[PDB]
A paper describes a structure:
Conjugative type IV secretion systems (T4SS) mediate bacterial conjugation, a process that enables the unidirectional exchange of genetic materials between a donor and a recipient bacterial cell. Bacterial conjugation is the primary means by which antibiotic resistance genes spread among bacterial populations. The recent cryo-electron microscopy (cryo-EM) structure of the conjugative Type 4 Secretion System (T4SS) encoded by the plasmid R388 revealed that the remaining VirB proteins form a large assembly organised into four sub-complexes: the outer membrane core complex (OMCC), the stalk, the arches and the inner membrane complex (IMC). Previously, we solved the cryo-electron microscopy (cryo-EM) structure of a conjugative T4SS. In this article, based on additional data, we present a more complete T4SS cryo-EM structure than that published earlier.
The OMCC is made of TrwH/VirB7, TrwF/VirB9 and TrwE/VirB10 (in this study, we use both the R388 Trw and Agrobacterium VirB naming nomenclatures). It is itself composed of two parts: the 14-fold symmetrical O-layer embedded within the outer membrane (OM) and the 16-fold symmetrical I-layer beneath it. Intriguingly, O- and I-layers are formed of the same proteins: to only mention R388, the O-layer is formed of the CTD of both TrwF/virB9 and TrwE/VirB10, while the I-layer is formed of the NTD of these same proteins. From the work presented here emerges a more detailed description of the VirB10 protein. Two sequences have been described earlier: one termed VirB10O-layer (residues 177–395; also known as VirB10CTD (see below)) which together with VirB9CTD and full-length VirB7 forms the O-layer and also forms the T4SS channel through the OM, and another (residue 135–153) referred to as ‘VirB10I-layer’ which forms an α-helix that interacts with VirB9NTD. One additional fact emerging from this and earlier studies is that VirB10 only contains one folded domain, VirB10CTD, functionally overlapping with VirB10O-layer.
Numbering used by the authors:
A (entry chain C), G (entry chain F): 17 to 44
B (entry chain A): 177 to 331, 349 to 395
C (entry chain B), F (entry chain E): 136 to 266
D (entry chain D): 199 to 331, 349 to 395
E (entry chain n): 177 to 247
H (entry chain k): 177 to 198
Write the structure that this text describes.
């Protein structure tokens, strides 16, 4: 009647780009 | 005389040898005992079977002088656990065995794994197997009582079941991505793999 | 001669020419453990983290939503980049009790084939053992 | 007679340190504390252990029924300047009482819930059977002996009572300061 | 004296030997401990009898340097 | 020659040039265990305590409020400064049954990268072991 | 039904600057 | 010293020999 709790699932509301600027490792 | 046996044996002295202070050799290439290594657990941990754990350092680890990064962040630590849990226990003993630096440095630290605040062993959610331990007895008793009721309405097996399944050790579940510490149990020396050089100014 | 071969191999690994970069990455969840940059070169996916950030644990998410381990290597001058050895539409980032989802919005199922046995198209891996 | 009382810490000296790790006695483990104060010599003139020195110890064996304190042995202290001495001394409370003590979990439910539940279901079944018109001892015998667990919070004050003489003659020396 | 038996045996030191860092030889021809190999199970597994399992790697496994496909 | 190198390394460690200091720190709680000064240089955080004060225990507070251990070194002429090896928005100070919260009010997520492997930008850590 | 007590949480009312004066280690 | 019997025996290392590809 009791099961192992799952890890937190992230909310899918605040979806935004990861890259605000081009990385310099890309040489750009 | 050798009399007064009880009083004479409670008066036997306890003589503890003194200690002399020493000094650490190179504190820039050294990580001493009691240093806390903060790493993030990669594998999900279930203590049914003996197994191996893995974590990655979340932060750089400096020397005792606090001037040289001896273990880089993202270093991979490998450990293992065994033996399972006993009734009333909620934490498993994990031994971390080896750490690999991203640049190829390897050191065998055989240290105890702890929680985020240094409490001994890893702990998570505990499954005590209540039903697997008591359901046989409960079911046997209830069917016995139901049969007795039906027999009356015409107008010990439960102890045996409980004796066999009462001793089932609990199982620990720890989620992946949980923060853990490694408390360094011995002195770690990095003199053979690193050296320092001054940078030419400007 | 072998030093010459080793120098050639290192030069070929470093030159890193003819590489296309995918920067279409979104994220939702706990932004405090978020990378400052994420991209892939068609073979590996790179997440870059700031100096003051803890390095989290990164997980591979399949179509049904199940997480699984993926091998990682830590690269970069200051060990600030986690490189995972796969290109995937969705990633999961976990640190403690915080989670963040990363979405590849330009996922290419085809990718580029690995005909050489190395991470670079300029080095063969050749069978020394013979036998 | 003691040799040099400026480079000496004798038995029975109290070292006041603050507990860093949170202590839970389920598994054997290692503790850590930091000295909150400078420790002087027996003459009281030279600081032999600086404040902020790190002490490493360990405990093992768990608790027995009726016990509320765990034995902790402190093994080594490291000075911020690099001095190391192996003191193998008993850890105590803030007022010198032996062992570390905190909040005790006696596992009442894990020890008696099986028996209570078995008895109550037996009685309920008997009542239902009557309304038509030992397993409890076995359960208790197996789970009655569960040792208690001690919880001690992080940041708690503790003492180390020095069990042996500590000699600092090889690592320090004194020199007079030129006046003005 | 050899008295104080209980207290004297709880004060026996635990001295753990230190460790020295080494270095891995060739990180392009190496797969180290703790590497995760992701494979797909071929056989159906039923634990009635002891038996042998079989799986196939679903992905390439690189070296610790991450530059050579070793498996 | 090695004495010359060691002298150069010590001079580079001491010179401590091009360092920015953050002094925006607030505190709430039990002020009797409070430091007299707190600041950070972008890599380490320094809490300075008075001569008559006991040195407390300092803990790392994450976003959810969970405390965790952080390594510390004791620096200063009179061992009156605790240097923690991290820069964090919130800190917890505990001594006995008294607690004090420290808040970094100018937290920089980016920080400054550690490209050299040492606490100073003037010393490389170089791989001696080769292998 | 009984759990380990938590350490005291500091009150968030008397929030004041730590630095009344510039430290001398900053050379200021 | 040989004390700390339980903790010292849980800290005994497990050293597994490496393998070479053929």
């Amino acid at each position: 009647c009791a099961s192992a709790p799952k890890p937190k699932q992230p909310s899918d509301f605040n979806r935004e780009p990861v890259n605000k600027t081009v990385p310099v490792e890309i040489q750009r | 005389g050798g009399g007064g046996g009880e009083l004479a044996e409670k008066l036997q002295p306890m003589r503890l040898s003194g200690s002399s202070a020493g000094r650490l050799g190179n504190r820039d290439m050294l990580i001493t005992q009691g240093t806390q290594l903060d790493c993030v657990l990669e594998t999900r941990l279930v203590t049914t079977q003996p197994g191996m754990t893995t974590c990655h350092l979340t932060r750089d680890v400096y020397s005792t002088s606090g001037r040289v990064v001896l273990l880089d962040r993202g270093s991979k630590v490998v450990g293992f656990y065994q033996g399972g849990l006993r009734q009333g226990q909620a934490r498993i003993f994990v031994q971390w065995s080896r750490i690999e630096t991203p640049s190829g440095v390897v050191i065998n630290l055989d240290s105890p794994g702890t929680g985020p605040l240094g409490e001994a062993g890893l702990g998570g959610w505990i499954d005590r197997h209540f039903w697997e331990r008591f359901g046989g007895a409960i079911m046997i008793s209830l069917i016995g009582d139901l049969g007795d009721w039906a027999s009356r309405q015409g107008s010990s097996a439960a102890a045996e079941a409980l004796r066999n399944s009462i001793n089932i050790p609990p199982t620990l579940y720890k989620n992946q991505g949980e923060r853990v510490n490694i408390l360094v149990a011995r002195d770690l020396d990095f003199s053979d793999v690193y050296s320092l050089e001054s940078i030419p100014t400007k | 001669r072998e030093a010459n071969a080793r120098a050639a191999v290192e030069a070929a690994f470093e030159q890193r020419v003819g590489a296309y970069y995918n920067l279409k990455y979104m994220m939702s969840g706990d932004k405090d453990i978020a990378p400052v940059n994420a991209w892939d070169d068609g073979r590996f996916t790179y997440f870059k983290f700031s100096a003051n950030a803890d390095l989290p644990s990164i997980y591979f998410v399949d179509a049904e939503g199940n997480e699984s381990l993926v091998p990682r290597t830590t690269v970069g001058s200051s060990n600030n980049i986690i490189a995972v050895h796969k290109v995937n539409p969705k990633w999961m980032i976990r640190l403690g009790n915080r989670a963040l989802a990363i979405f590849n919005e330009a996922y290419d199922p085809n990718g580029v084939p690995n005909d050489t046995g190395t991470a670079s198209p300029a080095v063969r891996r050749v069978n020394k053992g013979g036998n």
